[PDB]
Amino acid sequence: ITCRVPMAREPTVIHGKREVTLHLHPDHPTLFSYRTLGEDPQYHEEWVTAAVERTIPVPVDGMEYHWGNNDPVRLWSQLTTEGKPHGWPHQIVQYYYGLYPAAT
Amino acid sequence: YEHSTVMPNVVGFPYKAHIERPGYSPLTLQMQVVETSLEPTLNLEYITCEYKTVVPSPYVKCCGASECSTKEKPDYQCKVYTGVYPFMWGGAYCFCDSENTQLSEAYVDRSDVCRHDHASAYKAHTASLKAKVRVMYGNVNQTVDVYVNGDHAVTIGGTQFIFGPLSSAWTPFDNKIVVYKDEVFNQDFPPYGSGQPGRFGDIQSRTVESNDLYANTALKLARPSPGMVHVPYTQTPSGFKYWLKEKGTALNTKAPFGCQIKTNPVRAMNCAVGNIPVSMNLPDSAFTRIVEAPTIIDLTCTVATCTHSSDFGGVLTLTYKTDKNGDCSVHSHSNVATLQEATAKVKTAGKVTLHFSTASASPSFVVSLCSARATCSASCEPPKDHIVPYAASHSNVVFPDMSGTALSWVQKISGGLGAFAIGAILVLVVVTCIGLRR
Amino acid sequence: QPGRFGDIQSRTVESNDLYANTALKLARPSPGMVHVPYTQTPSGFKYWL
Numbered sequence: 001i002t003c004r005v006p007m008a009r010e011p012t013v014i015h016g017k018r019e020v021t022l023h024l025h026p027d028h029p030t031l032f033s034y035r036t037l038g039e040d041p042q043y044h045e046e047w048v049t050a051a052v053e054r055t056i057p058v059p060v061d062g063m064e065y066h067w068g069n070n071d072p073v074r075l076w077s078q079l080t081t082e083g084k085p086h087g088w089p090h091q092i093v094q095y096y097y098g099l100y101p102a103a104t
Numbered sequence: 105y106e107h108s109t110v111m112p113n114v115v116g117f118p119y120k121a122h123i124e125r126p127g128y129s130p131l132t133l134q135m136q137v138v139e140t141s142l143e144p145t146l147n148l149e150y151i152t153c154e155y156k157t158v159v160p161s162p163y164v165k166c167c168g169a170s171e172c173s174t175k176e177k178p179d180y181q182c183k184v185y186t187g188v189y190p191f192m193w194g195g196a197y198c199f200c201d202s203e204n205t206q207l208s209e210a211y212v213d214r215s216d217v218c219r220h221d222h223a224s225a226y227k228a229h230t231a232s233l234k235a236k237v238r239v240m241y242g243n244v245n246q247t248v249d250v251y252v253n254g255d256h257a258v259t260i261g262g263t264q265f266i267f268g269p270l271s272s273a274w275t276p277f278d279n280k281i282v283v284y285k286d287e288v289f290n291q292d293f294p295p296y297g298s299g300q301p302g303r304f305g306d307i308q309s310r311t312v313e314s315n316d317l318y319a320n321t322a323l324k325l326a327r328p329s330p331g332m333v334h335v336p337y338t339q340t341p342s343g344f345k346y347w348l349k350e351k352g353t354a355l356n357t358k359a360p361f362g363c364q365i366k367t368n369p370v371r372a373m374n375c376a377v378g379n380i381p382v383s384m385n386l387p388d389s390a391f392t393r394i395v396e397a398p399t400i401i402d403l404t405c406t407v408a409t410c411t412h413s414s415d416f417g418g419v420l421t422l423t424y425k426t427d428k429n430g431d432c433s434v435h436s437h438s439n440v441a442t443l444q445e446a447t448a449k450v451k452t453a454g455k456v457t458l459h460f461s462t463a464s465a466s467p468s469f470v471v472s473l474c475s476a477r478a479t480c481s482a483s484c485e486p487p488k489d490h491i492v493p494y495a496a497s498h499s500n501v502v503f504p505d506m507s508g509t510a511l512s513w514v515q516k517i518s519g520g521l522g523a524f525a526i527g528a529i530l531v532l533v534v535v536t537c538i539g540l541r542r
Numbered sequence: 543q544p545g546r547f548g549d550i551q552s553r554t555v556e557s558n559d560l561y562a563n564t565a566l567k568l569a570r571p572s573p574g575m576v577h578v579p580y581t582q583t584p585s586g587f588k589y590w591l
């Protein structure tokens with residue numbers, strides 16, 4: 001037969017430099033899980049009971065997080081950093097360092 | 105005409121294929137991948153499910169003895185006991201105080217709901233790939249289902265299309281997997297006939313309707329308590345429930361490359377890896393001759409704004425002189441930037457506008473309008489939004505052009521140093537010559 | 543900000559103006575039923591309390 005479930009509340013999304021901080025407001029124990037879509041993923045899953053906040057990394061490849069009983073949501077990060085790419089040499093140095101530090 | 109090309113296996117990425125032959129106008133090709141499925145060939149090993157312990161009523165004989173024989177039943181265990189004095193709700197059961205005997209037995213059989221709730225053990229072999237690809241050119245716009253094996257050949261508008269094989273032979277399933285309901289697990293299992301009590305595989309069966317069963321659950325009987333009629337038994341609990349409690353993390357939340365995993369049949373969908381070669385054989389009725397195609401002369405290019413973001417953040421305008429109105433095929437001959445439109449309308453006014461996306465600080469590419477060809481180069485600025493809900497629409501490239509600003513600084517500094525060193529080398533050579541001639 | 547302290551602000555107790563930011567989103571009703579569904583971030587005042 002077919003039996004019935006509630007959909008959990010949508011969470012609060014706060015952006016950041018290649019990072020997302022989520023606010024979770026559960027009414028029941030719900031299951032929260034995420035993964036990254038790269039070569040070697042960083043999986044995680046847990047049973048949230050009270051109101052908590054979690055930070056998830058979002059590489060350029062992408063992220064997917066499964067909250068409660070809703071469909072999973074995917075996010076991607078753009079190529080953003082500080083400095084100016086057409087100024088004095090230290091400016092482009094800072095720009096490319098902000099994009100890729102070690103290589104620069 | 106025959107053509108060959110390679111395309112990236114990423115869902116939703118538009119791809120332009122450029123085809124040019126003598127005596128015909130260039131034509132452009134749009135191929136997009138909509139959905140990919142990866143199915144491995146499976147062979148079953150055994151299935152498992154919870155059980156029930158069938159224990160029948162004890163046999164009590166007054167003033168006598170009994171012996172029981174072995175039976176070909178799963179984990180049969182019988183034992184005969186001497187010196188017992190049953191009691192019932194009215195009184196004693198037999199006259200003999202110590203000449204009695206109780207016979208006990210029990211065995212294990214699969215549960216009555218094993219057909220509806222069971223876990224299967226499989227073995228993964230070489231896996232096949234099938235996909236749904238759309239094709240757009242001219243006035244035909246169709247989607248076709250294709251096997252990516254190098255063998256399938258589909259026909260679209262009288263054109264033969266042959267796909268595959270995939271460059272990378274990578275599969276997310278390990279050699280031994282277990283499937284339950286709608287989850288798959290990369291977990292090894294004990295071999296048939298060698299299960300251990302308390303864990304996965306305490307009960308095995310070659311198939312769902314198999315008449316033979318192997319059970320090892322450590323059933324042991326015990327002596328009945330004085331003045332009572334009961335058959336006690338101590339047994340390790342079902343291993344299937346234990347596996348159902350701490351099975352682990354399902355592969356649905358562990359698969360790399362963002363592969364969605366479904367069952368019935370077991371398949372992994374939307375895996376992003378490798379490239380798909382494409383081989384085709386176009387007819388001669390899909391082109392246009394030069395005589396009735398427009399001619400574009402004195403074409404120069406410029407860029408108005410650029411911002412390397414995931415969308416089509418950039419516009420460029422083309423100026424030209426033509427003889428008659430018509431429609432031309434437009435394509436970018438490089439990889440750094442990908443265009444949006446595949447065809448454009450040309451007029452006697454002499455200006456067309458194009459959209460494009462890139463990811464480099466300073467891109468350079470060759471943009472072709474019909475048979476004409478011109479070069480473009482620009483400077484782009486970074487975006488401000490951090491995180492976006494759509495995948496990138498540009499091939500990931502970052503290296504700037506040889507004539508970009510930073511590379512220009514490197515070039516000029518290196519040139520100054522090289523000229524200075526060359527002058528020093530020349531002065532050393534001339535001094536050596538004059539010293540040696542003496 | 544929703545779900546935290548100060549999601550509903552009033553200049554004074556008796557003021558007639560109000561600032562509320564609680565992420566009120568509606569939803570389409572299920573077929574064959576009369577009801578208004580809505581998902582809303584819980585009160586930030588209780589969370590702070």
Ligand SMILES: *[C@@H]1O[C@H](CO)[C@@H](O[C@@H]2O[C@H](CO)[C@@H](O)[C@H](O)[C@H]2NC(C)=O)[C@H](O)[C@H]1NC(C)=O
Pocket residue numbers: 166167168199200203
């Ligand atoms: C009736 O009860 C008598 C006991 O009073 C039973 O006689 C016993 O029989 C067994 C085996 O036949 C002997 O080992 C015992 O020594 C006997 N006991 C006595 C006191 O003689 C007799 O078997 C019972 N008969 C029935 C039909 O139940």
Ligand SMILES: *[C@@H]1O[C@H](CO)[C@@H](O)[C@H](O)[C@H]1NC(C)=O
Pocket residue numbers: 240245246
């Ligand atoms: C191709 O056909 C599909 C299905 O109707 C449609 O969604 C799409 O917009 C069409 N594309 C073009 C370029 O006509």
